[PDB]
From a paper:
Sobemoviruses encode serine-like 3C proteases (Pro) that participate in the processing and maturation of other virus-encoded proteins. Here, we solved a full Pro–[name] 3D structure of [name] (RGMoV) that demonstrates the structural changes in three different conformations due to [name] interaction with Pro.
We crystallized and solved 3D crystal structures for two catalytically active forms of Δ117Pro: one in its [name]-free form, the second in its [name]-bound state with fused [name] at the C-terminal part (Δ117Pro-E/A-[name]), and one catalytically defective Δ117Procm form with S159/A mutation. First, in the absence of [name], L87 shifted towards the [name]-binding pocket. In Δ117Pro chain A, it is rotated away from the catalytic triad H49, thereby disrupting the functionality of the catalytic triad since D92 is too far from H49 to ensure any proton transfer. There are several more conformational shifts unique only to Δ117Pro and that are not present in Δ117Procm and Δ117Pro-E/A-[name]. These are the partial unwinding of the βII barrel and subsequent movement of the bII and cII β-strands and the cII/dII loop, and the disordering of the eII/fII loop. While H173 and N183 did not change their positions significantly, H150 and T154 were noticeably shifted due to the movement of bII-cII strands. This shift could also render the Glu-binding site unsuitable for cleavage site recognition.
Author numbering: 7 to 152, 155 to 197
Write the structure that this text describes.
């Protein structure tokens, strides 16, 4: 488990913070057909129905975190709050991403066994990463050695994304992540 230098995480990665700064989940901007969407975990987004969630990302110029208030009425495209703990996506205005310097990533459907990095942590400027693999036959995982704020964070193959982190398994420090292949094919129509 490595400690990533400030602002050296993928350009598509965002923290999802509470009003006080508590990092409760992560997300990413992704290309979805002709637009982009925030993609995250359903259970992270549910929390913004009763309180103010904030999209945040570390600024290089300013040398500190920046945030923008999320609007619960931004339209959810893929997924559902009501009855699902799967992946969920949101039409975030491009103006929000522009303010946050977030660039959008692509969904790769891995061809061969490939290394993957997942990111999370306690502030936008103090993130950590975790290693593992993505194999075409189903299974994609990172391994933590020896936390719910990682919820919704992607598994990156370079700057492309292949899966989304649900949670960590009950002891063993292995990831259980949603394969983004149903998401992609939905996006691509």
């Amino acid at each position: 488990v490595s400690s990533v230098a400030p602002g050296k995480e993928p350009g598509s990665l965002v923290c999802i913070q509470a009003k006080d700064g508590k990092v409760i989940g992560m997300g990413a901007r992704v290309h979805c057909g002709p637009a982009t969407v925030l993609v995250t975990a359903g259970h992270v987004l549910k929390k913004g129905m009763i309180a103010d969630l904030y999209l945040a990302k570390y600024s290089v110029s300013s040398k500190e975190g920046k945030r923008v208030l999320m609007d619960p009425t931004w339209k959810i495209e893929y997924g559902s709050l009501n009855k699902e703990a799967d992946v969920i996506s949101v039409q975030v205005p491009a103006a929000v991403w522009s303010r946050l310097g977030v660039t959008a990533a692509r969904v790769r459907k891995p061809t061969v066994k490939v290394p993957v990095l997942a990111y999370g942590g306690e502030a936008s400027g103090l993130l950590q990463s975790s290693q593992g693999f993505a194999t075409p036959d189903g299974n994609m995982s990172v391994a933590h050695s020896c936390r719910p704020g990682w919820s919704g964070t992607p598994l990156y193959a370079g700057s492309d994304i292949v899966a989304i982190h649900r949670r960590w398994e009950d002891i063993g420090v292995k990831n259980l992540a949603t394969n983004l292949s149903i998401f992609h094919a939905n996006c691509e129509s």
